[PDB]
Amino acid sequence: SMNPPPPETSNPNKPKRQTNQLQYLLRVVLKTLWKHQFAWPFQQPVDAVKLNLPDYYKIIKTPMDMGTIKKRLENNYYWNAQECIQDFNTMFTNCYIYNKPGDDIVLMAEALEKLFLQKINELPT
Ligand SMILES: O=c1[nH]c(-c2ccc(Cl)c(S(=O)(=O)NC3CCCC3)c2)cs1
Q1: Element housing 22 (H / E)
Q2: Do the beta carbons of residue 3 and residue 49 sit within 8 Å?
Q3: Is the CB of 51 under 6 A from ligand 1?
Q4: What domains sit in the chain, N to C, each tagged with a CATH number?
Q5: 60 ligand 1 Cβ < 6 A
Q6: Atom 15 in ligand 1: residue holding the nearest Cα
């Protein structure tokens, strides 16, 4: 298929964890970003069949999206906040890689990244 399987949202041989920071990343960071007017392209894995982008997964080898991140947080999939933050950063970076400076989609990612950084600047202790 043109679409690989989406990233795992559970893994039984990976240990789980819950922390105040991870709770915050779900309740505040993810759930607030989700509502932004520019969040929609990032709420699910890129569907190359739907969007007609047979090139997407030829270019992006570590795909990530907020739908996956949300499910991971709900699963307690992550060990710590930094691991989750890395997924957000991978999502943003993928967008910059797959596209071009100034593209509408890149403008969207740039705005979301700024808001994301604002919110993770300070996490609970
Ligand atoms: O690098 C990424 N692009 C996208 C994405 C998702 C949906 C849509 Cl419509 C778009 S887009 O920038 O408006 N390009 C559309 C024009 C043809 C394919 C989709 C990008 C999510 S991550």
Answers
A1: helix 20-24
A2: yes
A3: yes
A4: 19-123 (1.20.920.10)
A5: no
A6: 51
| C-alpha distances out from residue 119 to 25, 27, 62, 94, 123, Å | 9, 12, 24, 21, 8
Tokens of 82: 């930094």
| Cα-to-centroid distance, 86 and ligand 1 (Å) | 22
- Residue 114 carries which side chain, given as an amino acid letter? K
The technique is X-ray
95 CB near ligand 1 (under 6 Å): yes
Surface-to-core class of residue 42, CB atoms within 10 Å of its CB (0-12 exposed, 13-18 middle, 19+ buried): buried
Q: Tokens 């069949």, residue?
A: 49
Is residue 111 within 6 Å of ligand 1 at its C-beta? no
Angle at 93 between CA 1 and CA 36, to 5 degrees: 95
Instruction: Return the SS3 of 95.
Output: helix
- The two tokens of residue 28 are 């505040």
